[PDB]
Structures are given as C-alpha cells and as structure tokens.
Amino acid sequence: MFENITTAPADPILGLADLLRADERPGKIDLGMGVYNDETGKTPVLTSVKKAEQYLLENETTKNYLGIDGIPEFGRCTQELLFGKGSALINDKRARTAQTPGGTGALRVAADFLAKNTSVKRVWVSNPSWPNHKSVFNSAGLEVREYAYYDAENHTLDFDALINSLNEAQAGDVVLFHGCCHNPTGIDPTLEQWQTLAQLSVEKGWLPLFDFAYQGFARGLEEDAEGLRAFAAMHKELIVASSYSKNFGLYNERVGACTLVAADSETVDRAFSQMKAAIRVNYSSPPAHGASVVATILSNDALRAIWEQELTDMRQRIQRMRQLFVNTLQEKGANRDFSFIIKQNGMFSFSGLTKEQVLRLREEFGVYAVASGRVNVAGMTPDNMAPLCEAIVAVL
Amino acid sequence: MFENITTAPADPILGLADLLRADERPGKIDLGMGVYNDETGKTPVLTSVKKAEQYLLENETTKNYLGIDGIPEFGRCTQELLFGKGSALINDKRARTAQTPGGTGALRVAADFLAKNTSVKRVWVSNPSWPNHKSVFNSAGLEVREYAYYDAENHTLDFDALINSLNEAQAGDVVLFHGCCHNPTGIDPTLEQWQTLAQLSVEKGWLPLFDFAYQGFARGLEEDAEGLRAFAAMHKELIVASSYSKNFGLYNERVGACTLVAADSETVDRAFSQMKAAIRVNYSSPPAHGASVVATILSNDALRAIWEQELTDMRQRIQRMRQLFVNTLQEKGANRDFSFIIKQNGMFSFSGLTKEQVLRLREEFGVYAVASGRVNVAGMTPDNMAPLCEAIVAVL
Ligand SMILES: *Cc1c(COP(=O)(O)O)cnc(C)c1O
Ligand SMILES: *Cc1c(COP(=O)(O)O)cnc(C)c1O
C-alpha cells in the first residue's frame, strides 16, 4: 500500500529546524521559526505562566473531557481581548468561541466549517503571507487567490495595488487579513486604511477572516485590535482565528481560538453547532492545560499584571534589536540602507535578501533564515549581532 | 453567509452531557460517556500523573514548539507498549509514531493521510462500533462499510458472519479492528480468532487499522496487545491509532498516537513524511503537557510502578461493578438473565435495552445511557447501584 508514496517537500519554515540539528558547525544563528528569545538566546517559560501552572497543580481535581468548544472562561476572556470589554458583539451575544489546538488549529477548523457549510469557494490571501495559509485552505478543498500587498521596491504597503487587486474579489469570497504584525513583512495598515477596508468589505460583500497570532507585539493589546474592531463595528459576520502561542510563550501547548460572529445570537448558535460538528470529526475536544493557563492568568488581576509586563518586555526587546540591527549593519559597512526595517513591527522583517543570499548565509556562515528573506529579529541578541551582521555584509 | 446554515444533529454520546447539565432532577445517574469513576463517582487525577506534573513544573525550561511528530521518547515508549520490548518491528526500525491530540486525532490524521496518499477508498468497521468512526472517515472523503460482528440474540461474537461478511472486502480496502474492549459490545476475539483474522487479512490483502483506546482494561497491558502483535507478526504494513485518555485518566489533555508500519525503514520514512504534511495543515504540532506526562511516567521505573497499579485498580473496580450489577438486577427482580454482561470486558456493556427503554430511563428515572443501550459500567458505584437497578427493572 505504501510502496509508491512520494517524499513530501520540506516545510519552508519547519524544515529549517531539521537542518539546524544536523549542522555541527557551532556558532549557528537561528533566525527562522517565529519564536521569541531573550537576551540569552533562550525561550523561557513566562513567570506568570509558571505561577498559573503551580495553581493548576494544586487545584485541578479531574482531567475529565472539556466540552467540544473548550473552557468557557477561556472563550469569554478571548472575546474581551479581541473586541473590548464593553463590546456590543458580546452584550448582544453575537459571538461564539471554540478553544482550538493553536492558531493553526483555528484556521483549519474555520476552513472545514466553511467548506462544508457555506457556498464559499475562494479565499484571498496577501502576497506575501505565512506559507501555511495556502496549504491549510487548499487542504479543506478551497481555492486560494492572492492580492497585492507589499511594495518590494519601496518596502511599504502598496495600498492602491491592494484595493485594485481586491476588486477581483466577488461577494461571498473570503478575504484573510493579518490582525497586526503582518507575517512576513511586518507592515500593517494604518487605522484609516483599516477603516477604508472595512467599508469596502461591507460594500463588496466579502466575509472577513482575521488571523490574529501577534496581538500585543506591535503597539499594545488594545491598539493592536483597532483594525479588527473597525471591521467588527460594520460587519454582521466574520471569523477570527487567534493564537496564544507567542504572546504567552505557550507554543507547544497549542492554545488558540476560533471565534465566529453572526448577525444575532440565534444565527451564530446554529452556525456554531456545525463548527462543533467539524471539531468532533477532527480531534473531538481541545487540550486543557494550555488554555487553562491562559484563562487563569487573564481572569486574575495579579497574574494578568505580571503577564502584561512580561509581554511589554518582549515587545521592547525586539524593538531594541531592530534598532541595534540597523545600526550595526551600517557600522559594519553595509551596502545599502536598511532603515526601513525600523518601520516594521512584530518579530519579523522582510530583509530583501535573495534566495541565493539566504542559501549562502546558511551554507557559509551558519545563519538560518527563511528562503523568502524573512528574518526573526526576536532571535537576535547583543551577543550574535556582530557575527550576524558581518555575515550579511559578506553576501551583499 | 450564515443565514441558511442548518442546526447540526446532537452527538449520540457527547449530546448526553448537555442533557445532564440541563436536568435539575437530583440523583441523576450518568452511564453515558466512557469515563472512569471511582467508588465516589468522581474522576480524579491519577497520583502517578500528579507526581509527573510536579516533576514537569520544576524541570521544564521552555514551551518552544515540539516537532510535528511530537516528543520522541513518547513515540518510543508508545511503540514498546504496542509491539513489545524486543519487537522486530522496532529493531528493524519499520515503525514511525506521531504524537497526536487524542485517539480521535490519531484516527483523523490516519484518515487524511490515506485519502490523499493512497488508493484506499473504503474502510470496513464493525457493526456496531463507536459512532464517531463512520463520521471521521466520511469527513476525510472515505466510504464506510460495515461487517457483521455482534450476535444480538446470543450476546456473543458471531465469528462466522464476520468472516463471511468480510469476504466482500477487496484487496486494498482498510479494515478497522478494536484492539481490545470492543466499544460498545465489550466482546473481543479470542487469541485463536485474532490469528485466523491475521492470516485471512494477509491473504485478502487488507490494510489493518487498529483503534487501541483501552489497552490495560481487559486483562492487562501485554495481554491486551496479543491481537495486534499477532497481526504485526505477519503484516508488512499497518496503522495503529492509540489513546492514553482512559488508561492514564488524561481525557482532556488529548494524548494519543498514530503509528505507521511499513515493510522497511526507507518506506516508512517516506510514508511518514506525508503523514507529517497532513498534520502541518491541521494543527501543526501536538500539545506537550499530556504526552510529557505519559513519557515521564513510562520512562521512570518508580512512577511506572505506581501507574500500573492504579490502572490495575481501575480494571478491578469495573470488574466488581460488573458483578454487583448482575447480582443486584437478579436480587431486584430482573425479568431476564444478564449473566452475559459478566463475559464482556472494558467500561461498557451492550445491555440489550431498546431505544424506548433508554429514553424512558432518562425521562422518568434520570438514568442516562446511550440510545444504543450501551451503558458505562465504570460509572456505577455501590451507592447508585440500587436505584439504577430498580429503574432498569421498572422498564423491562
Ligand atoms: C504563529 C502563526 C499562526 C498560528 O500558530 P500556532 O503556533 O498554530 O498558534 C498563524 N498565523 C500566523 C501569521 C502566525 O504567525
Ligand atoms: C475513547 C475512544 C477513542 C479516542 O478517544 P480520545 O478521547 O480522542 O482519545 C477512539 N476509539 C474508541 C473505540 C474509543 O473508545
């Protein structure tokens, strides 16, 4: 049965991990997968998280199955984080949230739900975008189209090409938007552009689907949700796939959420029943530990205060490396100006390096980045900055 | 977009949970979902598990993503549990294991993998079987056929109808087998019958797929794997979807595994690469906490000793309730003989009650069981046995 199966192509992001643990050459620098590192180059467990785990160990009395949609409190805290404490969406009970296994899990559940319960056939994604986006929607049987987004020449958001590109999007098509910290460009729309998009969306009849995996890494928790809230104010329906992997440093516990919004509570309830059916035939019910930690933290004023500060520390350290990176490149005799990197938010940065330059950095210097030229600034430390910049200068 | 979505039908098993927490009538008795309860009617965290969680809290230094296939040690301990310490399958490196989110997750991953990488089009399942089996395979686009299994009249395994029924299975079809503790009948094939099936399987060219969610609940860890090992000895290829939800009482942490076996290491490696591709487009990587606990326990002689005993205690308490159940029914003036229930293993028992009798038990007595007449013996306690049996006698 398995004789003729072909070897699957390596994942553009996850595949780097395999190359790393196969490279003896010490001094390696990992700027691939989007994981936060502190000044030491380690990815520690947040203190707020350890304290929540301590709490769960002392108070958990059973591991009995959670409902298909997960921990209710988790869903509530998630909705408040997304739409705001006194949001009308919450008061009118127009939103239902299912706890899922990571942000990827949320996107997959949204995909399956749409494919077998709606007339949706096309999903529009930005060019460029997280590579797994196309793969997930295609796996559900949905076709993916791309819309212009990044201006490679000016290293900015080409809003005119975006709008014009989307005119090709028909009513009933899904349009995916990154909530903030666009992966891989790091370029997000301004508040006015979001408002223009929200308006256009309603008029063209698109179904907005937000991928929110970096809330808190651009400017702040509330500020980072302004774009989504602009859409939520004019739309009757939308879908939000969120992730807590990065802002809680809970990567391997797979904590995410898929939020569904409809015109009213009776409609979202009916729709949600079909979303739960899609979960039952996938993994049945979500993993408790990770989500339990997030709910415990967000619902406790003491722990939430600590967590919010740790999040602020992470954002500020990336902003510092982003600065040290640009200065060191210049200081090390960089060819061109990389000041544009200062205007990008999040862990990433589209460096502008070609595939060959990325390959050479890996082959000759032990510097690992994604073939697209995407680099994880969060993987930069005051200690590896020098050799990293020297390697980059050598390939320019 | 969501205006015309229809309400999904309630899950035959999970739906009971909703009815329970909507029923004021105190004294309710839950014999539905397959969850273990102790003499108190509670589902506690195993002591071995709490100790492992204590260990993880003190020693975990990062929550960084696990590989797509999960924790390597977990995979190793799983293979040893399934095939045996000195198994040839392990020595020849013919098996690859992916850590998944529960046993359901393992079945879904196996389904997706088969649908897009093989010529498989049909999956044969026993009549009756866990209801979610048909739903999971159908969701992957595979058709499901049923083969005779249970003799409703004699309350035994009709081996002749099974064999004859399977002659309709073509080479290249998948045939699903419950490793032990058949859900819902509790009737498993004898070792000689397994051997006859293994032989027939090889000859007809079927691809065996074992659902192993109750290892340790029939006779013991090793004894419960005799059937699978009989197949593993004659087959070049097979798939095993296992679950640790029940034997570790880790239901809500979603810990399972999907093991793939091929003729040789180069073939299983190629095949496995495609299985990982299927995981990447679903939930990306598995939840660490649950599996970490299982690996910590199984790899530590001290903790494994405690866990094995707790497992033995669970099996023995169900065997006692199975006895007290039959005796009390007789003692309470039961109509017919339920001695056949003593010959069934696992948490369940196909009681023989009709759908109406099950509905009446729920409506008039607050006793909840699955419409098929399946009852969770593990939910019976010395305290609820009397009222439970009185209710059953009243509907006979
Ligand atoms: C990290 C990320 C996700 C989801 O990741 P999970 O690890 O599954 O939580 C989704 N979209 C983008 C753009 C991401 O960066
Ligand atoms: C419990 C069970 C499963 C899988 O359950 P998970 O909770 O997803 O681990 C699969 N098959 C049968 C027959 C089961 O009883």
Side-chain angles (χ1 to χ4, degrees), chain A residues 281-301:
Chain A
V281 295
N282 189 340
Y283 56 82
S284 193
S285 60
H289 194 66
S292 291
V293 167
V294 172
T296 300
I297 292 175
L298 294 174
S299 64
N300 181 301
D301 290 348

PDB file of all heavy atoms in Angstrom, chain A residues 281-301:
ATOM      1  N   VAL A 281     -15.166  15.539  14.429  1.00  0.00           N
ATOM      2  CA  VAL A 281     -14.562  14.613  13.479  1.00  0.00           C
ATOM      3  C   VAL A 281     -13.075  14.872  13.219  1.00  0.00           C
ATOM      4  O   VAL A 281     -12.472  14.265  12.329  1.00  0.00           O
ATOM      5  CB  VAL A 281     -15.329  14.612  12.130  1.00  0.00           C
ATOM      6  CG1 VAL A 281     -16.730  14.079  12.347  1.00  0.00           C
ATOM      7  CG2 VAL A 281     -15.386  16.019  11.544  1.00  0.00           C
ATOM      8  N   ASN A 282     -12.482  15.763  14.007  1.00  0.00           N
ATOM      9  CA  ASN A 282     -11.069  16.085  13.873  1.00  0.00           C
ATOM     10  C   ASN A 282     -10.310  15.606  15.119  1.00  0.00           C
ATOM     11  O   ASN A 282      -9.617  14.591  15.080  1.00  0.00           O
ATOM     12  CB  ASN A 282     -10.889  17.605  13.694  1.00  0.00           C
ATOM     13  CG  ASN A 282      -9.456  17.998  13.341  1.00  0.00           C
ATOM     14  OD1 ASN A 282      -8.516  17.244  13.572  1.00  0.00           O
ATOM     15  ND2 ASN A 282      -9.289  19.202  12.794  1.00  0.00           N
ATOM     16  N   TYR A 283     -10.452  16.323  16.225  1.00  0.00           N
ATOM     17  CA  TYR A 283      -9.745  15.938  17.443  1.00  0.00           C
ATOM     18  C   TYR A 283     -10.667  15.821  18.659  1.00  0.00           C
ATOM     19  O   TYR A 283     -10.203  15.652  19.791  1.00  0.00           O
ATOM     20  CB  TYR A 283      -8.606  16.934  17.696  1.00  0.00           C
ATOM     21  CG  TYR A 283      -9.079  18.360  17.769  1.00  0.00           C
ATOM     22  CD1 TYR A 283      -9.626  18.867  18.941  1.00  0.00           C
ATOM     23  CD2 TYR A 283      -9.025  19.194  16.647  1.00  0.00           C
ATOM     24  CE1 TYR A 283     -10.111  20.161  19.001  1.00  0.00           C
ATOM     25  CE2 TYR A 283      -9.510  20.501  16.697  1.00  0.00           C
ATOM     26  CZ  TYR A 283     -10.052  20.975  17.881  1.00  0.00           C
ATOM     27  OH  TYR A 283     -10.537  22.259  17.964  1.00  0.00           O
ATOM     28  N   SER A 284     -11.972  15.924  18.404  1.00  0.00           N
ATOM     29  CA  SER A 284     -13.022  15.794  19.421  1.00  0.00           C
ATOM     30  C   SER A 284     -13.183  16.950  20.414  1.00  0.00           C
ATOM     31  O   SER A 284     -14.217  17.611  20.441  1.00  0.00           O
ATOM     32  CB  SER A 284     -12.840  14.484  20.188  1.00  0.00           C
ATOM     33  OG  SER A 284     -13.997  14.200  20.946  1.00  0.00           O
ATOM     34  N   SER A 285     -12.181  17.158  21.260  1.00  0.00           N
ATOM     35  CA  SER A 285     -12.202  18.253  22.227  1.00  0.00           C
ATOM     36  C   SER A 285     -10.748  18.716  22.370  1.00  0.00           C
ATOM     37  O   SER A 285      -9.822  17.928  22.177  1.00  0.00           O
ATOM     38  CB  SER A 285     -12.800  17.800  23.574  1.00  0.00           C
ATOM     39  OG  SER A 285     -12.069  16.743  24.161  1.00  0.00           O
ATOM     40  N   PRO A 286     -10.539  20.004  22.696  1.00  0.00           N
ATOM     41  CA  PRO A 286      -9.227  20.642  22.856  1.00  0.00           C
ATOM     42  C   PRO A 286      -8.425  20.317  24.117  1.00  0.00           C
ATOM     43  O   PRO A 286      -8.985  19.934  25.144  1.00  0.00           O
ATOM     44  CB  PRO A 286      -9.569  22.126  22.761  1.00  0.00           C
ATOM     45  CG  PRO A 286     -10.872  22.186  23.505  1.00  0.00           C
ATOM     46  CD  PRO A 286     -11.624  20.944  23.042  1.00  0.00           C
ATOM     47  N   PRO A 287      -7.090  20.468  24.045  1.00  0.00           N
ATOM     48  CA  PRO A 287      -6.202  20.196  25.182  1.00  0.00           C
ATOM     49  C   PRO A 287      -6.379  21.253  26.274  1.00  0.00           C
ATOM     50  O   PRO A 287      -6.262  22.458  26.028  1.00  0.00           O
ATOM     51  CB  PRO A 287      -4.810  20.212  24.547  1.00  0.00           C
ATOM     52  CG  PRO A 287      -4.968  21.184  23.411  1.00  0.00           C
ATOM     53  CD  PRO A 287      -6.313  20.796  22.836  1.00  0.00           C
ATOM     54  N   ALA A 288      -6.646  20.787  27.487  1.00  0.00           N
ATOM     55  CA  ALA A 288      -6.896  21.676  28.612  1.00  0.00           C
ATOM     56  C   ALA A 288      -5.751  22.503  29.207  1.00  0.00           C
ATOM     57  O   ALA A 288      -5.918  23.698  29.453  1.00  0.00           O
ATOM     58  CB  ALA A 288      -7.564  20.882  29.728  1.00  0.00           C
ATOM     59  N   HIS A 289      -4.596  21.885  29.436  1.00  0.00           N
ATOM     60  CA  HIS A 289      -3.503  22.595  30.099  1.00  0.00           C
ATOM     61  C   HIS A 289      -3.192  24.012  29.631  1.00  0.00           C
ATOM     62  O   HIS A 289      -3.270  24.954  30.416  1.00  0.00           O
ATOM     63  CB  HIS A 289      -2.216  21.774  30.073  1.00  0.00           C
ATOM     64  CG  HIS A 289      -1.173  22.293  31.015  1.00  0.00           C
ATOM     65  ND1 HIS A 289      -1.332  22.268  32.383  1.00  0.00           N
ATOM     66  CD2 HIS A 289       0.014  22.904  30.785  1.00  0.00           C
ATOM     67  CE1 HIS A 289      -0.289  22.841  32.958  1.00  0.00           C
ATOM     68  NE2 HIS A 289       0.542  23.237  32.010  1.00  0.00           N
ATOM     69  N   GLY A 290      -2.830  24.159  28.360  1.00  0.00           N
ATOM     70  CA  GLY A 290      -2.505  25.471  27.829  1.00  0.00           C
ATOM     71  C   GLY A 290      -3.584  26.516  28.018  1.00  0.00           C
ATOM     72  O   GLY A 290      -3.323  27.587  28.570  1.00  0.00           O
ATOM     73  N   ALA A 291      -4.792  26.225  27.549  1.00  0.00           N
ATOM     74  CA  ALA A 291      -5.906  27.157  27.683  1.00  0.00           C
ATOM     75  C   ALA A 291      -6.214  27.454  29.164  1.00  0.00           C
ATOM     76  O   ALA A 291      -6.573  28.582  29.513  1.00  0.00           O
ATOM     77  CB  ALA A 291      -7.142  26.592  26.997  1.00  0.00           C
ATOM     78  N   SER A 292      -6.099  26.441  30.022  1.00  0.00           N
ATOM     79  CA  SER A 292      -6.351  26.631  31.457  1.00  0.00           C
ATOM     80  C   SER A 292      -5.428  27.708  32.014  1.00  0.00           C
ATOM     81  O   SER A 292      -5.843  28.529  32.842  1.00  0.00           O
ATOM     82  CB  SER A 292      -6.108  25.336  32.237  1.00  0.00           C
ATOM     83  OG  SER A 292      -7.080  24.358  31.934  1.00  0.00           O
ATOM     84  N   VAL A 293      -4.175  27.684  31.566  1.00  0.00           N
ATOM     85  CA  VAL A 293      -3.183  28.661  31.992  1.00  0.00           C
ATOM     86  C   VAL A 293      -3.581  30.066  31.530  1.00  0.00           C
ATOM     87  O   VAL A 293      -3.526  31.021  32.305  1.00  0.00           O
ATOM     88  CB  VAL A 293      -1.767  28.305  31.437  1.00  0.00           C
ATOM     89  CG1 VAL A 293      -0.818  29.481  31.602  1.00  0.00           C
ATOM     90  CG2 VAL A 293      -1.207  27.096  32.185  1.00  0.00           C
ATOM     91  N   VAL A 294      -3.991  30.191  30.274  1.00  0.00           N
ATOM     92  CA  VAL A 294      -4.384  31.493  29.741  1.00  0.00           C
ATOM     93  C   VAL A 294      -5.608  32.070  30.456  1.00  0.00           C
ATOM     94  O   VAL A 294      -5.665  33.278  30.709  1.00  0.00           O
ATOM     95  CB  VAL A 294      -4.681  31.418  28.227  1.00  0.00           C
ATOM     96  CG1 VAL A 294      -5.281  32.741  27.743  1.00  0.00           C
ATOM     97  CG2 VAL A 294      -3.397  31.111  27.466  1.00  0.00           C
ATOM     98  N   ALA A 295      -6.584  31.217  30.767  1.00  0.00           N
ATOM     99  CA  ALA A 295      -7.798  31.668  31.448  1.00  0.00           C
ATOM    100  C   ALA A 295      -7.483  32.060  32.891  1.00  0.00           C
ATOM    101  O   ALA A 295      -8.017  33.039  33.410  1.00  0.00           O
ATOM    102  CB  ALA A 295      -8.858  30.561  31.435  1.00  0.00           C
ATOM    103  N   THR A 296      -6.627  31.283  33.532  1.00  0.00           N
ATOM    104  CA  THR A 296      -6.235  31.550  34.913  1.00  0.00           C
ATOM    105  C   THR A 296      -5.525  32.901  35.015  1.00  0.00           C
ATOM    106  O   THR A 296      -5.776  33.686  35.934  1.00  0.00           O
ATOM    107  CB  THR A 296      -5.302  30.451  35.429  1.00  0.00           C
ATOM    108  OG1 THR A 296      -5.984  29.193  35.367  1.00  0.00           O
ATOM    109  CG2 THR A 296      -4.877  30.730  36.885  1.00  0.00           C
ATOM    110  N   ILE A 297      -4.639  33.166  34.062  1.00  0.00           N
ATOM    111  CA  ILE A 297      -3.891  34.415  34.037  1.00  0.00           C
ATOM    112  C   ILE A 297      -4.772  35.627  33.748  1.00  0.00           C
ATOM    113  O   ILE A 297      -4.765  36.598  34.504  1.00  0.00           O
ATOM    114  CB  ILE A 297      -2.757  34.360  32.989  1.00  0.00           C
ATOM    115  CG1 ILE A 297      -1.688  33.351  33.442  1.00  0.00           C
ATOM    116  CG2 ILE A 297      -2.154  35.749  32.796  1.00  0.00           C
ATOM    117  CD1 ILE A 297      -0.567  33.122  32.425  1.00  0.00           C
ATOM    118  N   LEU A 298      -5.536  35.565  32.660  1.00  0.00           N
ATOM    119  CA  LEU A 298      -6.399  36.670  32.268  1.00  0.00           C
ATOM    120  C   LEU A 298      -7.538  36.977  33.243  1.00  0.00           C
ATOM    121  O   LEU A 298      -8.020  38.106  33.294  1.00  0.00           O
ATOM    122  CB  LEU A 298      -6.984  36.408  30.874  1.00  0.00           C
ATOM    123  CG  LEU A 298      -6.011  36.394  29.688  1.00  0.00           C
ATOM    124  CD1 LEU A 298      -6.741  35.966  28.406  1.00  0.00           C
ATOM    125  CD2 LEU A 298      -5.409  37.777  29.518  1.00  0.00           C
ATOM    126  N   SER A 299      -7.974  35.989  34.013  1.00  0.00           N
ATOM    127  CA  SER A 299      -9.068  36.220  34.947  1.00  0.00           C
ATOM    128  C   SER A 299      -8.593  36.613  36.339  1.00  0.00           C
ATOM    129  O   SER A 299      -9.412  36.882  37.219  1.00  0.00           O
ATOM    130  CB  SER A 299      -9.959  34.979  35.051  1.00  0.00           C
ATOM    131  OG  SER A 299      -9.247  33.888  35.602  1.00  0.00           O
ATOM    132  N   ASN A 300      -7.279  36.654  36.533  1.00  0.00           N
ATOM    133  CA  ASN A 300      -6.695  37.014  37.832  1.00  0.00           C
ATOM    134  C   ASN A 300      -5.924  38.325  37.679  1.00  0.00           C
ATOM    135  O   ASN A 300      -4.924  38.393  36.958  1.00  0.00           O
ATOM    136  CB  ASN A 300      -5.759  35.903  38.306  1.00  0.00           C
ATOM    137  CG  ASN A 300      -5.140  36.193  39.662  1.00  0.00           C
ATOM    138  OD1 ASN A 300      -4.448  37.196  39.842  1.00  0.00           O
ATOM    139  ND2 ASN A 300      -5.383  35.312  40.623  1.00  0.00           N
ATOM    140  N   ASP A 301      -6.401  39.370  38.346  1.00  0.00           N
ATOM    141  CA  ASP A 301      -5.772  40.684  38.268  1.00  0.00           C
ATOM    142  C   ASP A 301      -4.279  40.662  38.575  1.00  0.00           C
ATOM    143  O   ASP A 301      -3.497  41.340  37.915  1.00  0.00           O
ATOM    144  CB  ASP A 301      -6.470  41.657  39.222  1.00  0.00           C
ATOM    145  CG  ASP A 301      -7.867  42.017  38.766  1.00  0.00           C
ATOM    146  OD1 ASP A 301      -8.223  41.701  37.611  1.00  0.00           O
ATOM    147  OD2 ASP A 301      -8.610  42.623  39.565  1.00  0.00           O
TER     148      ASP A 301
END
